[PDB]
Symmetry: D2
Subunit: 421 residues, 4 copies
């Protein structure tokens, strides 16, 4: 029943037959005889799941243990939203357990916050943090700035010519020409003041702009390319070396994100009465302030940290990001946080706590937020997709929730560290 | 239909009956108006999956769109390994697509590297980097250091006293006492050289040890508590302020991880022939070098980066980490990377490339690696679980593969930026 | 005699003798803090303070070789120094000619490090034979970065949003600007840390370095803000957000004082003969020392060989605040191939936070003015306010580059 | 020879492309030659040069010398440090700096004084080397971490000089690059030249074990010298020192014009939270660089080394029975300092070292004078932090 290569190939090349009329073993036989390249499987095979099934079968013969994929699931998942948009060479999916911490009492609302993690006690501990906030009267937050960035590097023939371009970009008329080119690429593109920096004949230019409820990499990058195209008409000796010169800065540690901000800059706060610190967090305000000063400020300082003046902000950021279809690699910068703890009240027994996070890189449209399970976690918070009547509000709201959940996480871990055990 | 709460409690307390003998609505009736909290559903209800269903039904009435969870899957997932171990208040799982990138030719072996992501083109781009490495004769790597850390902060009454504790810890006999206390807590606990730092009367002590194939936080922290307990015998006035004083440093950016290392320090390299750079990567060696210098070195420097002298190592680390059951929040430090490129060979036209990654925090036993799907990805690489013949070898191998896959990804993104998209 | 000497003080101290004034202090007829005003001449004030100090030392002949005579204390007293016991001579050597923007500078350098001046001089020579160096001032504006507290972080967020409106900034600008001729407030930069708000005021200062001028403007500016926000507390007029005399990435990224760039091309022949190395070797060492090496050491802004040496020496010679070497030494030195066959050395130095002035502070002293005069930048520039301080910043960046050329060549040659 | 000729005559021979007996006359002729190049030749007339002892400068401290620059020297003291009193010299042209430091010294005196300790001691040099492959540089790193490897490198380092005593090595790879941090004490000298000389023979010995090793540069910026760097903050360089003092509430009130509660609020939110918002590495202090710089110029130190020597974290806590007294500490992990060599060979500079009782080598215990000077810098920096922070908290 398994036919020779030549007969299998004419069926493959027959337009009203194709791969649907071949068996798995026949397509695999063609791949092993070098008649079909492995990468062509995607467009040849009719069903997305069958493409995955055959890729898995081919992969399995190459492994030192043939059954290693047995427990990697792949069936009955919606590959229609993933192929050609979210992932390639797909062999299945990786399930991450999702837990819920809440209610998180933030800006007079209540949020049930999804958290995808495999770290024991993180969800329960964050949920204790939420309790302390809820019985403490709730938290308030503000978005202080908003704008994704891209920081390309361009080269001029001399440092004198890069100084020329820099000064041209700071004149109102030169900026306006660049701004019109940038803003024409999308309805959300609103270029803010340009920040630039010279290193000899290099010039690093930092384009910042809102992006609606999208995280905005693709949008800002498309606007950046058009903006540099206009700049090249005025300076034709300029060389566009890279559309990212690491001055954005994206997915690496950098002081510029900390100081200037990137994406949403957020601040969150709360006052925890002495009673609640006692009953929920099992400690005193005094013990918490001592740990916070000497761990999160002084410890982080001795360690030579830029932007890591916090206990485990990245835990909460990472968990929410995975659950809500964010780019989890952007937790590098998005976890930037400084946690402050102060005595409040007449006897200094209440705890003022705040978290400031200047660089939360987040969105509710595009990327992994296109997928339906990820959309379910976004719907939990009432932030899924674009907001028609107030663009950016959904991404802004999700960013506030991230900072407030980070604060809940900070409360709980700092109490456990102050306690002992 | 739902009978009174009185009778329902009697049926639950009856061991021959239990929760099996109640309806979904009666379990929910008891939760609404105390008697059962919500977290006790873990241990009370007949099965794990029914507990999840009950928790989903509770959560849904709290949401402002009752159908939010519709597309968040939960049925037929193996929760036995998750409850009490990896996650709490569990309402389901989040599918993250997994693609394969390889073969990765590293140390005369081949690796089919699993990668869990939602960013379009990430897996295909890394896969191109792999082809360039494979046609170039392969990549080589070495593990330079190995030791997970914990960085407690203690205080003495005076800085003179904290100074006395530092000096005693620097004596051979003082260190030997502390090493004996640390090493008695576990078979893999083998304390390495101590690094300490003073901030007035504060003393930050960085304990470092290998940890078999486990990432090793729980073990090292246990060793740390016993060691501080022993230090207190010699210095009774010492207060342990926090078992983590942010001097480790864990899940925050810190120069000390960059300079001293944390977990596995790894270097990787490869020479890519000029022909391969032209054909596969669509660029030249001369162009790659100029972008790497001015983006990854000069660009990151202008941005104020500590440890972020690379293009997108965080993308590869994050995707391998999610796929293989690592703690994704450790991406913060694990993505630390310097990428270097230079002319090579007789013509001086071949591309030399190296990625050095001082702080890969990784493990093939514990946490998320206990789950079967992420074990399947570990098994692809041949690094699943502990290595009995050579403790630590699987975790070392996995760190080599991470640094190699990063180098692959660096080759392909850097070529794309150099060639102007 | 004791009470006879007190009688002569009631007329004066100039009539009295050294030993009698010292007798009056040791026996407690007169306290020692009163001698500053009673004694008329400044040099004799210094002399008596030295003699009173010497008896308290374990080696009373300590001050023998510390000089104090025949020096202009009238400019020092009440403006540059207190409790003055003399002065410290710092050798001044000269490196030049420095060929910068069609001019030629003889650069004074106060230092006690052997070979520093000569090495800097050899760099100037390689620059001169390469066709000279060019330079541009990219930005200019001294800063002060006060910290204010509000009752809540919602309130501080509100104040930041107010300062970001066209209407709020304009009101703060007017208050700031009324304090001084050259006080022209530029765009504000702020950061919140909870209920803290850090506000970075930045303005030109003519030819002055500008610290005391920007603080004056900052105080009056925060006074106007207080009327719009009564519950605001002014914690400290400097909240380290400036940032002054401490390492800080904000200075590296946003700049402070003069940001400057400088460049030159050194012909291959000049690299072989004057610098005793090759273009290929200079580039290899610069990449792996100043970029990769500084990166492995966790450097923010220290991507250079020894800019601090040159910055420090010029600064001491030219009456600058030498403690500002901390941030003023920020520098990145780049080297690449150039010319037909990639054999000439392109070199550039970028220094974004040179903190400098030609009026005020130690530039009001005459020896320091002489070194400023050597370079043609002493005092204020009448026709073009701030042009002298900009020129000195270009000289600093240019001399630094000469210093990077020489030292980097010596390291490459081994 | 030259004494027979006159000033105008000698200039003539230099202009015609073709030594003098006294050092002061050589300085005079250089000034006159340089005057011909300046657009205002009379600018040198108030730059002094007469009757300076140029014998210890030429061929040691400065070249092309045209004179000297007078920096005013004030005195802050007495500073009560480790049960002694120091009259601390400070060379500065910044008004109020000495008087403010002086007020900080007063405050510490009335609080029973300051105590300090030296936590570590070792100057460094951080050469960069290269190997064909990263696999080879990895091999070299591993070899340097064996006790046999370190021992042979130690023997080589230690043979170059009396005080050359090599401590643990620190290394970093960057591909085929290897950065190696050598650390040794250096008697009472700052130690740069000694540690470089030791580094040269050690690297030459390493080259025997690895003949394909290129020595790219003897300083590859891994030291790190005269540039900001986290490695100095974390590992230290030169003297790591700590200093402390408790100021009675009465003294904070009357001498410092503020409260303990107020001082703590400003210190936390300026020196910690502000420096953090500014992206600072090691700059968690108000103005340590003022004090370091002034003491350095007065005492013949390398003033360019204030970049790293200023590294300081200033901490302030509540203290005492009613929690009303002010605990203060400064911690400075990288004070680069010496009492012999460089500018400490000059007599004026030695006058200031003698005030402090730390001039020259300590014959009874080599390195104890430089250690003492570092302690004095840390204590005087703490004095300075007290006064300025009090002034800032009080509203001026
Ligand atoms: C955040 C959770 C997972 N967590 C907790 C926790 O919050 N426990 C209290 C708790 C537990 C369960 C509840 F239901 C309620 C409260 N304590 C520790 C912990 C601390 C020191 C140790 F030595 C080892 C574990 C961790 C791991 C922190 C880890 O992911 C980041 C941490 O390393 C960052 C840092 O502080 O440096
Ligand atoms: C990593 C992949 C997804 N990728 C690629 C890519 O590898 N393209 C080449 C390619 C693609 C598919 C193939 F099958 C083979 C080769 N180009 C870009 C990109 C660059 C600049 C833009 F403006 C916008 C997109 C990205 C996203 C960059 C992002 O994840 C990190 C980047 O922002 C970090 C940085 O360099 O700053
Ligand atoms: C700048 C001068 C003082 N200098 C020179 C010098 O330029 N010599 C060449 C020269 C000499 C006289 C001339 F007339 C012409 C050329 N070579 C070295 C030197 C470097 C590494 C050593 F191991 C040991 C000595 C220094 C000390 C640099 C020092 O102050 C900062 C340095 O540590 C910064 C760094 O690269 O890390
Ligand atoms: C240290 C002295 C010179 N000083 C003083 C001072 O100590 N005053 C108290 C005092 C004065 C005289 C006495 F006799 C006794 C006590 N207040 C200020 C000052 C001015 C404006 C300001 F906006 C911020 C401070 C300065 C200049 C600091 C300056 O060199 C570093 C500063 O920029 C570092 C910083 O805090 O950011």
């Amino acid at each position: 029943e398994p036919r020779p290569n030549e007969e299998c190939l004419q069926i493959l090349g027959n337009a009203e037959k194709g791969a649907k009329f071949l068996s798995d073993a026949e397509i695999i036989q063609l791949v092993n005889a070098k008649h079909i390249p492995a990468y062509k499987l995607e467009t040849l095979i009719e069903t997305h799941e069958r493409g995955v099934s055959i890729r898995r079968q081919l992969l399995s013969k190459k492994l030192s243990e043939p059954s290693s994929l047995q427990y990697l699931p792949y069936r009955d998942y919606n590959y229609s939203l993933v192929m050609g948009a979210c992932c390639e060479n797909v062999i299945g999916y990786m399930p991450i357990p999702v837990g819920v911490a809440g209610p998180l009492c933030l800006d007079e609302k209540e949020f049930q916050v999804p958290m995808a993690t495999t770290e024991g006690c993180l969800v329960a501990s964050t949920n204790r943090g939420c309790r302390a906030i809820g019985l403490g009267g709730g938290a308030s937050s503000r978005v202080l700035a908003d704008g994704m960035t891209r920081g390309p590097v361009v080269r001029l023939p001399r440092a004198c010519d890069s100084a020329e371009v820099k000064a041209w970009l700071e004149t109102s008329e030169g900026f306006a020409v660049i701004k019109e080119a940038f803003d024409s690429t999308s309805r959300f593109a609103r270029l803010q003041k340009l920040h630039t920096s010279i290193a000899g004949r290099n010039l690093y230019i930092r384009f910042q702009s809102r992006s609606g409820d999208a995280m905005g990499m693709n949008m800002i990058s498309k606007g950046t390319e058009k903006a540099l195209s206009k700049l090249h008409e005025y300076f034709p000796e300029m060389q566009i070396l890279a559309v990212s010169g690491n001055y954005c800065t994206d997915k690496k540690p950098a002081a510029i994100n900390w100081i200037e901000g990137r994406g949403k800059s957020v601040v969150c706060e709360a006052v925890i009465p002495a009673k609640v610190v006692r009953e929920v967090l099992k400690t005193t305000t005094e013990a918490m302030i001592e740990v916070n000063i000497n761990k999160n400020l002084v410890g982080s300082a001795m360690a030579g940290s830029i932007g890591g003046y916090n206990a485990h902000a990245a835990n909460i950021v990472t968990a929410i990001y995975i659950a809500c279809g964010q780019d989890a690699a952007q937790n590098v910068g998005s976890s930037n946080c400084i946690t402050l703890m102060e005595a409040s009240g007449p006897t200094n027994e209440d705890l003022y706590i705040s978290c400031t996070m200047p660089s939360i890189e987040i969105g509710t449209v595009g990327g992994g937020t296109n997928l339906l399970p990820q959309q379910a976690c976004l719907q939990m918070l009432g932030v899924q997709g674009a907001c028609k009547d107030n663009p950016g509000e959904n991404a802004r709201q999700l960013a506030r929730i991230v900072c407030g959940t980070v604060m809940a996480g900070e409360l709980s871990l700092m109490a456990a560290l102050a306690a002992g055990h």
